Design an enzyme around this catalytic site. Structure first.
Site, PDB file in Angstrom:
ATOM      1  N   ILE A   1       0.851  -1.184   0.000  1.00  0.00           N
ATOM      2  CA  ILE A   1       0.000   0.000   0.000  1.00  0.00           C
ATOM      3  C   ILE A   1       0.888   1.235   0.000  1.00  0.00           C
ATOM      4  CG2 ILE A   1      -1.992   1.097   1.066  1.00  0.00           C
ATOM      5  CD1 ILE A   1      -2.419  -1.501   2.619  1.00  0.00           C
ATOM      6  N   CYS A   2       0.782   2.034  -1.057  1.00  0.00           N
ATOM      7  CA  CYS A   2       1.508   3.298  -1.153  1.00  0.00           C
ATOM      8  C   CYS A   2       0.751   4.339  -0.338  1.00  0.00           C
ATOM      9  CB  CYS A   2       1.659   3.727  -2.608  1.00  0.00           C
ATOM     10  SG  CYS A   2       3.133   4.717  -2.947  1.00  0.00           S
TER      11      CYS A   2
END
Lengths: 377, 150, 76
Positions: free
Chosen positions: B84-85
């Site tokens: 997850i950025c």
């Protein structure tokens, strides 16, 4: 040549050209963008198709969103290259609790004020260490160091800064924090309750001591930069402000003008925009400071979700400014000069078509640079 | 040897769970959490159940937790490995944040995806250029991977 | 030691920094040179993002190296 003449000129030129307002040729943009994007091109198969795909997906001609860079580009146009470099030599002036210092720094002439806002970057965690093991030219910085006879702050540069604690007080806190997980822990953990154990009360007392002494130490770091334009008007209260800004990973100056946010900030009044901006540096209310920080700095429209959750501005904030008069005979001469350079190198009927020609040339120079680089396998 | 706050945080998570997020610690690794985030309404992930696995590192809380999707999801800020950025797990993590703050972000990230580099991620370019068809992609991946997978 | 910082627009600047200084110190010198806030910066050292709390003595950085300052960021 009124002050609202140049304000409307930059407004329509930034709205229609974006990066082309900087005057950099498309060849240099594509040449330098190929330096960042070379690691994404595939090395097998038809190289012409592999390079074309990366060329299509690059945002090299998209306007910058660095707040400090948009403020630099506004200063170069209005003041000129030399005038803006002289403007940088001047220092900023911190705003007070009511913004009276800026309120008095606005005579009824054409003015440009640049704002540099800082966020308090106070240290957030400590470490117990024996004085034998403490080398301030190697140890982790921006950290509190609790020694057996001194509680001290290592700043962001190398300087050791005493916190004014007795050797007996430090000896008590040193021998109270005994559990191994707390020898290198954070200062203000919310789950640490001083009424539970005597060890945690010493940690909490250390936090209250550090939080008090940090108020007199310079721990600020710039978090945002923007620009405000004050035209010369026939006084009364026909005086208006227009702030210019971009934002990191948020919006561009082109989107700022396109959303007319400079006008939602306009009719707020001279004293209105300033009083609420001084407000922002005063309050300690956490859920009542992010409302403002979003009200002035959000992208157009999203003034209600820009500072929620974790983007909720917790840390204290300060704002600073510096002013200089603008001469519209030189500002408009700099603006129509870029319009001439644009209309010469990349002419067209619509300004949307002039940007397409600029994108194609940047994509052509980026292509030729990429295929030259990828010849090394 | 569980630190006292990780003990305190676990009891808070089990006493008032985040609405739409199930978070429980592993039976053998108290630093390991099994997370199920429900698909938000008015989003292409609506009706889906997405499995996440959160791990509290040893530098926690001075370091951010390591979280990553386990269910395949078509999102501009989630790569093929499930990373997850988010702005928390990268640079601007602070000790003031906690596990619930991370879980709330990921849940909010599903409803409001962020822009991203169209390079090294064809999902990000598809969301920026062809949103309606990228949204159509996410509804397909939600039925194939995020439905009846618990 | 002198190192160089470049942008997309070709603008290269010079800094006075030494291997002991960190990224925040480098970004602080960029603030005094170009007026850019550090929170509005994220610098690449040849395909390598430079984290906030790490020094020059940890990224194999040496004297006279061209650091790539990006001024547009999308995501993370």
């Amino acid at each position: 040549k009124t002050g609202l003449h140049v304000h409307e000129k930059i407004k329509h030129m930034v709205k229609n050209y974006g990066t082309m307002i900087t005057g950099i040729p498309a060849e240099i943009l594509g040449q330098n963008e190929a330096e960042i994007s070379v690691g994404y091109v595939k090395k097998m198969g038809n190289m012409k198709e592999n390079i074309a795909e990366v060329v299509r997906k690059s945002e090299m001609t998209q306007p910058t969103n660095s707040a400090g860079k948009a403020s630099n580009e506004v200063c170069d146009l209005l003041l000129g290259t030399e005038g803006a470099s002289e403007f940088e030599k001047s220092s900023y002036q911190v705003l007070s609790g009511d913004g009276s210092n800026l309120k008095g720094s606005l005579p009824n002439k054409n003015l440009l004020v640049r704002v540099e806002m800082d966020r308090f970057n106070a240290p957030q965690k400590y470490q117990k260490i024996k004085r034998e093991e403490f080398n301030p030219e190697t140890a982790e910085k921006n950290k509190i160091y609790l020694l057996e006879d001194q509680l001290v702050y290592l700043d962001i540069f190398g300087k050791v800064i005493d916190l004014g604690q007795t050797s007996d007080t430090c000896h008590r806190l040193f021998n109270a924090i005994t559990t191994p997980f707390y020898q290198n822990y954070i200062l203000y953990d919310e789950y640490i309750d001083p009424e539970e154990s005597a060890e945690e009360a010493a940690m909490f007392e250390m936090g209250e001591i550090v939080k008090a002494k940090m108020k007199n130490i310079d721990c600020w770091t710039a978090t945002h930069s923007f620009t405000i334009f004050v035209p010369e008007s026939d006084s009364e209260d026909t005086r208006t402000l227009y702030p210019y800004q971009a934002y990191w990973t948020s919006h561009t100056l082109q989107q700022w003008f396109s959303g007319d946010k400079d006008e939602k900030l306009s009719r707020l009044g001279i004293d209105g925009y300033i009083e609420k901006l001084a407000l922002l540096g005063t309050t300690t209310d956490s859920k009542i400071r992010s409302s403002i920080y979003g009200e002035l700095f959000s992208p157009p429209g999203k003034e209600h979700v820009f500072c929620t959750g974790m983007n909720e501005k917790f840390s204290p904030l300060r704002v600073k400014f510096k002013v200089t008069e603008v001469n519209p005979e030189i500002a408009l001469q700099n603006l129509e000069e870029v319009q001439e350079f644009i209309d010469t190198n990349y002419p067209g009927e619509n300004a949307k078509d002039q940007c397409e020609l600029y994108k194609i040339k940047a994509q052509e120079a980026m292509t030729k640079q990429l295929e030259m680089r990828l010849l090394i396998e | 040897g569980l630190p006292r706050r990780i003990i305190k945080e676990t009891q808070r998570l089990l006493a008032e769970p985040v609405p739409g997020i199930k978070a429980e610690p592993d039976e053998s690794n108290a630093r390991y959490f099994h997370v199920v985030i429900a698909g938000p309404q008015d989003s292409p992930f609506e009706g889906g159940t997405f499995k996440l696995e959160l791990f509290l590192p040893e530098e926690y809380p001075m370091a951010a937790p390591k979280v990553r999707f386990m269910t395949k999801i078509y999102h501009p800020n989630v790569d093929k490995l499930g990373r997850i950025c988010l702005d928390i797990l990268k640079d601007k993590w602070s000790p003031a944040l906690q596990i619930r703050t991370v879980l709330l972000s990921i849940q909010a990230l599903l409803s409001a995806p962020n822009p991203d580099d169209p390079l090294a991620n064809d999902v990000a370019e598809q969301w920026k250029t062809n949103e309606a068809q990228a949204i159509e992609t996410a509804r397909a991946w939600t039925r194939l991977y995020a439905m009846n997978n618990i | 030691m002198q190192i160089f910082v470049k942008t997309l627009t070709g603008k290269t600047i010079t800094l006075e920094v030494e291997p002991s200084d960190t990224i925040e110190n480098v970004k602080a010198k960029i603030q005094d040179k170009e007026g850019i806030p550090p929170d509005q910066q994220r610098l690449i050292f040849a395909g390598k993002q430079l984290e906030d709390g790490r020094t020059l003595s940890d990224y194999n950085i040496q004297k006279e190296s061209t650091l790539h300052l990006v001024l547009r960021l999308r995501g993370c």
